[PDB]
């Protein structure tokens, strides 16, 4: 999240200097052209679990 | 089900991107099961999930 917000702020600064826009009022419609399209679209692997597959919670290193 | 098989996967791929070849392997075996050559001029990459779902992979541009 820090990386993405930094990217958006960097592009806002570039547009303020180069684009000459006085200020950036970021909205989701605008967001698409700053960060691009969303990498994550589906929350889980399986929206519906077929037979023999079950989701389980794991406590990993991170 | 009953045939000892040897497969050669050329090296060069970084291990993190190695599972992206898994999908390929599947069809390869399927072809060798029915002797139908894979359609020419076809590329394919992806990670199999033991049930059929294909996971995203990196290095799509390269």
Quick recap:
This is part of a larger assembly, with two copies of chain A (62 residues). Chain A is mainly α and 62 residues long. Chain A has two helices and no strands.
Q: How would you characterize this protein structure?
A:
The structure is cut from a larger assembly and holds two copies of chain A (62 residues). The first copy, chain A, is mainly α. The two termini of chain A are 16 Å apart. The first copy, chain A, has helices at 2-19, 28-35. Chain A contains two helices and no strands. The first copy, chain A, is elongated. The interface between A and B is small, with 5 and 4 residues.
- State the end-to-end CA separation of chain A: 16 Å
Radius of gyration of chain A: 19 Å
Count of separate DSSP helical elements of chain A: 2
Would you list the SSEs of chain A in sequence order as H and E?
HH
* Most residues in contact: chain pair: A-B, 5 and 4 residues
Describe the largest sheet of chain A. Answer: none
Helix content class of chain A: 40-55%
PDB class: hydrolase
Keywords: Human mitochondrial AAA+ protease, motor protein, hydrolase
Entry title: Human Mitochondrial Lon Y394E Mutant ADP Bound
Chains A, B: Lon protease homolog, mitochondrial
